[PDB]
């Protein structure tokens, strides 16, 4: 029972995306055992390229991003004294069934793109 | 057009009236 | 700005154009005022050095009020050093607790005390070098959430809201304002932050033998196109360059302290090219 | 751990292993996924099972028993009902 | 280079008389800033009274919950599923100590997650939380903040009395989870003795806590769940009874309202950052001159005309509503009466004013009558909720949207009965709206005297359907031509002079809340033209690569074309080959590129470039 604002749940669902769909596999998904790791940079990529809708990058994004990982949805494998300079390494801590639920709440599909 | 110009054009069709 | 991810998957009149804009945005200090006045927080987030234009606003608006000018650029600040100015300077309190979260409480104690005491807060790169943690951001937000504190910041780095959440930035209550300047960062890249000469100017330092033991580092660099140590000290010892191990090994010690000789684990290679080598062998022939 | 040669184990590999066991059981069908998480918790706090030393639910271990004292086990065990008694012979 | 700058410090003092209201009163005393006070202090009331209202039936369980443990080991806990947003709770938790200090029947200790790194840090600010939450009802030094000295202290005050003691824990989330293990397993060592209630602040869902807590940790826990409403509910809530409200004079437009509703729906739960938003477009609003001062109660409004200095009347004619009122004036002399004589419009405000005040009085009535017209019909063309179609019927001509004739289409399949009683449910919810909200508000009597005939008129027209398929055409026609064609215009369509009340200006309130740094970094990079305004520097296409360019966008042309590794020595040669001293101007535009991200240095490579926006 999890709400959230409508880009968060695309970020949640992109961050679920890049952390399960092995990212050599994202040339051919996207350009139109563990959960693995993923950059900020795949996953802003990952979120354009499921948004369809283009929105801009502003201040309440990666604000989004931030309380995102601030209520553990997200978690911070790896660096987090260097999260603006791009070395920073996260992974998605939530379960296929909720993605779906999220999928099913907004309209997006997930196993198509599973 | 500005204010200037619409207010002059309008008091000088007033005048002219 | 809506960038496309198909990119990271696939991988004079100036002067007098910066003085009209420099105007412009000096215009806008009474709004400024009046925002400050109600709460906000000013945010400016131009492409060049907006340095200047905040020392504008401190000399010709608060130049009267108690002001905390940070220089954020600064490659050695501590969020200590702030809190003990703050502590130590504006309330005559002392030095700040060790804990810096303490500290705010202390600072949030004693400012309840005092209305009509504001603070101006004037922080030149938010997103500085000794403030990119989440702590110091948590820090200034619970700063900024104080009504006598009075916040303006300036931000030049693009990732900088990847440290913000939602709830530092509903404490950091944010009017953002494109200030635009096409200045250079001259003050805020000149900091620490952001060789053949120099190995002959510090060669021409030493004495004999030890130029002696570097020449025959540079030969058998030279012959080979990292030599070992027992090769170096058999070469120094058939010279009489050296008289035990000990004074090559501190000699060496020098030689990796001004940069000559790298040491590989002994391997002692010297990171300059053969052609220069063979140059600076016939200077010193 | 006999068939990987003492390799590091997981709580998904376990409960897949276990699942595969307790749809054919007729005596565990019922059981969800949170009490085997608790059943799984309960042996880590025992140090039966120690980390390596990533999620509560991903984090790989190490079983601190010998295979003997599991063997005796099933045999000094009370009431152990003979489907378990079966499924530990192979 | 300057003094204000050294090579030592960073922070410098500038202390004028501090010790241990900003403006002037050129513009305190002003009349456009008490009226925006006057608005901002009744608007923020309003909400928070909503928001209280909203909170105290979880507030009487919560203090129920407690009282209920003092009346009476497991340590009793109460998991408080609130929200996503973190900042809005912590006046429900200041509440809840409120209530509890009020009947005293505990004292409260609020466990931030910043004050709790440690354990020892944990039960140090917990012992020192307690002990100063007592001193401060009716001081140790932290390392000296121990459990026995907590259970002494509790034995020399409330033992002869049973005082429960609470800790709040508001960011249930943000905790350390083994810090948080060792906290419950201490605090339920110590039950019996000294009595402990956990109240929470989780905020996801009940899985977060099921999942944190182990085996041997839950089992000291006796937890029971209350609820708080979600955000949007509160949201449509506030925005219901509030911003939608008709005793408020200033009034949003279509555009800033659906511009703050989707920052909280699309962005953000935080209806804190929603009132943030209203009160700059309060503030941009009311500070456009002493001429929107008027943007308030008529006879205030009236005095307030009486007060206006000229340039005021020089910015109520600069207003674009006002040229086609001066443009269907027939009379000549009239023009001329209004546009220099200054005082023939001082007599001519007061019926502006209240024939704006009775528009939006109409417009507020109208809208419900129509909401519960019209969203009770299935498939919901022009949206159930009063805001959705308060956006619609501002921003656009109701009538000509064809979204409207589908309105009508399927409100005309209906059969006889329930079309009836929806127009009757219709009717009488508009007249207890009549009834309550618009009668005590003044120039309230005008606005029922105004509608209420054509509710009667409509409610005959029922009783005639009632009395005899074709007549629901006619009652129709009535509905449209007597409510939706006349009260319900678009902001375009408006009275004259209706900018002092709305707030239309979407641009700069847009660009100054929500913050782009990125689109400005870009657009001052990709054409510096756009901000200095050179005769030099413009671009006709935005890759052509002038050669009069600042430096930074040579270089930042340069390396946007490139591969993801970029060298140094081609792209200094091709540096050189766009416009010694250039060696100097291409490194400090690197410096000047790096500072700002778009690059970082290959110190790990042969010094080299690396690119890492892309």
Not at chain 5, 477 to 497: G, M
Request: glycine share 4%; aromatic share 10%.
């Amino acid at each position: 029972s999890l709400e959230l604002p409508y880009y968060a749940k695309f970020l949640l669902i992109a961050a679920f995306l890049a952390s399960h769909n092995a990212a050599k596999q994202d040339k051919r998904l996207f350009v139109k055992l563990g959960p693995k790791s993923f950059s900020i940079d795949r996953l802003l990529a990952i979120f354009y390229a499921i948004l369809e809708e283009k929105v801009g990058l502003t201040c309440n994004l990666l604000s989004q991003i931030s309380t995102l990982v601030h209520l553990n949805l997200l978690s911070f494998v790896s660096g987090e004294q260097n999260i603006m300079e791009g070395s920073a390494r996260l992974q998605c801590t939530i379960g296929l069934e909720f993605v779906l639920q999220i999928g099913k709440v907004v309209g997006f599909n997930v196993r198509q793109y599973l | 057009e500005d204010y200037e110009i619409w207010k002059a054009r309008m008091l000088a069709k007033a005048q002219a009236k | 700005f809506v960038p496309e991810s198909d990119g990271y998957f696939h991988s004079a009149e100036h002067e007098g154009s910066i003085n009209a804009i420099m105007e412009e945005y000096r215009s806008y200090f009474p709004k400024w005022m009046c925002i400050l006045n109600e709460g906000f927080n000013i945010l400016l987030y131009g492409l060049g050095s907006k340095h200047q234009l905040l020392q504008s606003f401190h000399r010709e608006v608060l130049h009267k009020q108690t002001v905390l000018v940070v220089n954020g650029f600064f490659p050695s600040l501590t969020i200590k050093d702030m809190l003990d100015s703050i502590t130590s300077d504006i309330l005559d309190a002392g030095i700040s607790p060790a804990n810096p979260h303490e500290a705010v409480d202390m600072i949030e104690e004693e400012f309840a005390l005092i209305p009509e005491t504001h603070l101006f807060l004037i922080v030149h790169n938010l997103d500085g070098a000794m403030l990119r943690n989440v702590k110091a951001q948590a820090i200034l937000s619970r700063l900024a959430r104080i009504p006598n504190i009075h916040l303006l910041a300036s931000i030049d780095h693009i990732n900088t809201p990847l440290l913000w959440d939602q709830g530092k930035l509903c404490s950091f209550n944010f009017s953002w304002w494109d200030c635009t300047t096409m200045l250079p960062y001259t003050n805020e890249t000149a900091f620490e932050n952001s060789a053949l000469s120099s190995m002959r100017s510090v060669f021409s330092s030493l004495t004999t033998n030890s130029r002696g033991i570097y020449m025959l580092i540079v030969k058998y660099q030279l012959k080979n196109k990292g030599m070992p140590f027992r090769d170096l000290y058999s070469s120094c010892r058939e010279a009489f360059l050296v008289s035990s191990d000990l004074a090559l090994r501190a000699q060496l010690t020098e030689f990796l302290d001004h940069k000559l000789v790298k040491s590989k684990r002994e391997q002692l290679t010297i990171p300059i090219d053969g052609a220069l080598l063979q140059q600076f062998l016939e200077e010193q022939e | 751990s006999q068939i990987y040669d003492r390799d590091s184990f997981n709580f998904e590999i376990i409960y897949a292993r276990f699942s595969k066991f307790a749809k054919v059981s007729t005596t565990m069908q019922a059981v969800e996924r949170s009490i085997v998480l608790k059943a799984f918790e309960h042996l880590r706090i025992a140090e039966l099972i120690m980390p390596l030393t990533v999620q509560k639910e991903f984090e790989m271990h190490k079983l601190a028993l010998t295979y003997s004292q599991i063997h005796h086990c099933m045999q000094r065990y009370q009431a152990l009902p003979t489907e378990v008694a079966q499924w530990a012979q192979s | 280079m300057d003094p204000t700058i050294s090579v030592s410090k960073g922070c410098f003092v500038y202390k004028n008389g501090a010790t241990r209201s900003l403006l002037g009163k050129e513009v305190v005393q002003q009349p456009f800033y008490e009226e925006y006070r006057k608005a901002w202090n009744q608007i923020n009331d309003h909400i928070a009274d909503l928001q209280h209202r909203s909170y105290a039936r979880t507030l009487e369980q919560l203090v129920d919950f407690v009282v209920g443990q003092a009346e009476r080991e497991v340590l009793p806990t109460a998991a408080l599923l609130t929200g996503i947003n973190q900042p809005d709770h912590l006046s429900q938790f200041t509440a809840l100590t409120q209530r509890l200090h009020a009947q005293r029947a505990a004292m409260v200790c609020v466990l931030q997650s910043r004050d709790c790194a440690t354990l020892k840090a944990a039960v140090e600010t917990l012992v020192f939380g307690l002990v100063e939450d007592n001193a401060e009802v009716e001081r140790l030094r932290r390392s000296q903040c121990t459990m026995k000295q907590l259970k002494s202290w509790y034995t020399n005050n409330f033992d002869s009395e049973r005082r429960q003691l609470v800790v709040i824990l508001p960011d249930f989330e943000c905790f350390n989870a083994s810090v948080l293990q060792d906290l419950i397993l201490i605090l339920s060592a110590h039950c019996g003795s000294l009595p402990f209630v956990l109240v929470l602040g989780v905020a996801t869902a009940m899985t977060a806590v099921h999942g944190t807590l182990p085996y041997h940790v839950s089992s000291k826990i006796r937890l029971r769940v209350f609820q708080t409403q979600a955000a949007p509910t509160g949201l449509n809530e506030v925005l219901d009874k509030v911003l939608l409200s008709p005793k408020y004079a200033f009034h949003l437009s279509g555009k800033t309202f659906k511009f703050l509703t989707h920052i909280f729906l699309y962005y953000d739960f935080s209806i804190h950052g929603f009132i943030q938003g209203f009160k700059y477009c309060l503030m941009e609003h009311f500070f456009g001159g002493n001429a929107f001062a008027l943007c308030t109660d008529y006879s205030k409004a009236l005095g307030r005309i009486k007060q206006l200095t000229h340039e005021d009347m020089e910015t109520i004619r600069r207003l674009p509503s006002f040229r086609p009122y001066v443009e269907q004036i027939n009379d000549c002399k009239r023009i001329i009466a209004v546009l220099t004589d200054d005082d023939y419009l001082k007599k001519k405000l007061p019926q502006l004013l209240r024939d704006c005040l009775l528009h939006f009085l109409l417009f507020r009535c109208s809208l419900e009558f129509l909401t519960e017209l019209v969203g009770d019909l299935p498939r919901c063309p022009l949206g159930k909720l009063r805001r959705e179609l308060y956006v619609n019927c501002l921003n656009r001509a109701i009538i000509s949207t064809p979204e409207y004739k589908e309105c009508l289409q399927m409100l005309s399949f209906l059969s006889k009965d329930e079309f009836v009683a929806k127009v009757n449910r219709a009717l009488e919810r508009t007249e207890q709206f009549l009834v309550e909200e618009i009668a005590p508000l003044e120039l309230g009597e005008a606005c029922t005297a105004v509608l209420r005939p054509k509710l009667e008129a409509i409610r005959l027209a029922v009783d005639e359907v009632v009395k005899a398929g074709r007549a629901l055409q006619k009652t129709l026609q009535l509905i449209e031509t007597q409510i939706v064609q006349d009260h319900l215009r678009a902001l375009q369509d408006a009275p004259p002079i209706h900018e002092l009340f709305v707030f239309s200006d979407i641009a700069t309130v847009r660009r100054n809340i929500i913050g782009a740094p990125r689109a400005a970094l870009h657009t001052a990079l990709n054409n510096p033209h756009f901000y200095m305004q050179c005769k030099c520097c413009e671009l006709q296409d935005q890759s052509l690569l002038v050669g009069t360019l600042p430096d930074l966008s040579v270089v930042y042309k340069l390396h946007l074309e490139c591969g993801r590794m970029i060298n140094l020595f081609d792209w200094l040669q091709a540096f050189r080959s766009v416009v010694p001293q250039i060696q100097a101007r291409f490194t400090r535009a690197v410096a000047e590129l790096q500072f700002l991200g778009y690059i970082k240095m290959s110190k790990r490579k042969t010094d080299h470039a690396t690119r890492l926006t892309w």
